[PDB]
Amino acid sequence: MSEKKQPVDLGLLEEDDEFEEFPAEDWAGLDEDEDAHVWEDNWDDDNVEDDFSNQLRAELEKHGYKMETS
């Protein structure tokens, strides 16, 4: 029928009317570093990236101190 897509596109118009080009530019701050890059790898790199965003992001500089303590 393809006629039920109209209210869904109206919901997309409401989501686009919530923030006017705010997620396109704010998310484009990372998309400019993510553009043309394979998005299949961005799920693993974003998985470990967001996983380590809270604490122990790099953790490679700390191993030099953890060698003698552990």
């Binding site: 570093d33 790898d41 693993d44 790199d45 470990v48 990236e49 790099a58 490679l60 500089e61 191993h63 030099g64 060698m67």
Partner: peptide
């Protein structure tokens, strides 16, 4: 390699085109 890997960690970032990919090379 782990004692000297800190130079690869610090040198890996602070680069024009090589910084934003520093998470992928490490893992």
């Amino acid at each position: 390699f782990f004692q000297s890997l800190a130079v690869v960690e610090q040198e890996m970032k602070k680069d024009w085109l090589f910084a934003p990919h520093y998470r992928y090379y490490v893992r």
